[PDB]
Design a binder for this molecule. Structure first.
Ligand SMILES: Nc1nc2c(ncn2[C@@H]2O[C@H](COP(=O)(O)OP(=O)(O)NP(=O)(O)O)[C@@H](O)[C@H]2O)c(=O)[nH]1
Ligand SMILES: [Mg+2]
Lengths: 140, 174
């Protein structure tokens, strides 16, 4: 049994549920895309196709976002494992630590810090998405 | 998505003063008496909406112990807010706030916002630092101060809200 990693797994599943909804409507939107492409009152339907382009856009923003949220939770899990492993290694005294023990202890500390690093890289790239959305949606 | 902008914050202070439990109650509405010292550094997210604005809080939690002080220094620079946490039940923690501020000057870029909290005020019984001492010290530096308790959810909100705004005001005003 587990304890409030629970939250991580329920949330991961919900993220893939809504991911699933999203590429569902990506498929639908794409097919209406080529139907109306086949078409070309025509002014009204051009308005509608405009709506659909807006829709593809919104769906991509949400999709790339969900993909990030997913890898966020995967990293959080990996971090949890790595961390508790380093601590179990740290309970033994330094006097009892040989080269194998010391070095692999070492190795998991650095892997841990690197995982934290990538978490932050996702925060930052998530931000570049926020700012680009502001920038080109500025015309809208 | 939801956030207009995100601010990087930093929690520093002697080990055991409760930085991690403070961040834990802010982000999770919860507390755990169990003492598990931060290894290296961590960070957690909470998005807030003040001034009709949603801001993503990326809150870095430093390890108090000198072992990692080295590593923790690395993350002072990007910080856009910093909270110096001392323990009311320990005065030596209170006196090291000077050491932490020196660390801030050596590594954080001078523009940083700053705030001080005396935590574990949930029980006065073993208080060794009077609240008046803390405030006059903060005023000496000019930065805002507050006592808090992660056990009792006192001012954790309050604190994070105000430092978050002061960085807002400072940066949008610029
Ligand atoms: N009564 C009370 N105890 C608290 C409060 N905040 C933390 N504690 C307790 O004090 C200890 C400090 O916890 P912790 O948050 O790990 O402190 P820390 O400053 O993060 N330690 P470190 O810097 O080594 O990681 C824990 O045993 C915790 O349960 C508080 O507001 N009130
Ligand atoms: Mg801690």
């Amino acid at each position: 049994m587990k304890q409030e990693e629970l939250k991580r797994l329920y949330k991961a599943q919900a993220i893939q549920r809504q991911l699933e909804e999203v590429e569902e409507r990506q498929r639908a939107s794409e097919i209406q895309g080529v139907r109306l492409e086949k078409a070309l009152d025509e002014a009204q339907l051009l308005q509608e196709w405009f709506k659909l382009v807006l829709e593809k856009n919104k769906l991509m923003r949400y999709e790339s976002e969900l993909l990030i949220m997913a890898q966020e939770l995967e990293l959080e899990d990996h971090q949890s494992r790595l961390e508790q492993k380093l601590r179990e290694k740290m309970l033994k005294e330094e006097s009892q630590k040989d080269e194998k023990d010391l070095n692999e202890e070492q190795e998991v500390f650095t892997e841990l810090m690197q995982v934290i690093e990538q978490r932050d890289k996702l925060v930052d790239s998530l931000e570049e998405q926020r700012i680009r959305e502001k920038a080109e949606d500025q015309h809208f | 998505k939801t956030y207009d902008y995100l601010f990087k914050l930093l929690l520093i202070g002697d080990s055991g003063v409760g930085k991690t439990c403070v961040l834990f109650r802010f982000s999770e509405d919860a507390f755990n008496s169990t003492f598990i010292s931060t290894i290296g550094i961590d960070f957690k997210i909470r998005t807030i909406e003040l001034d009709g604005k949603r801001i993503k809080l990326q809150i870095w939690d430093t390890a108090g112990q000198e072992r990692f002080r080295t590593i923790t220094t690395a993350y002072y620079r990007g910080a856009m807010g910093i909270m110096l946490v001392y323990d009311i039940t320990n005065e030596k923690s209170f006196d090291n706030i000077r050491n932490w501020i020196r660390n801030i000057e050596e590594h954080a870029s001078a523009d940083v916002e700053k705030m001080i909290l005396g935590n574990k005020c949930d029980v006065n019984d073993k208080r060794q630092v009077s609240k008046e001492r803390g405030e006059k010290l903060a005023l000496d530096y000019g930065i805002k101060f507050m006592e808090t308790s992660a056990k009792a959810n006192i001012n954790v909100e309050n604190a994070f809200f105000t430092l978050a705004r002061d960085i807002k005001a400072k940066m949008d005003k610029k």
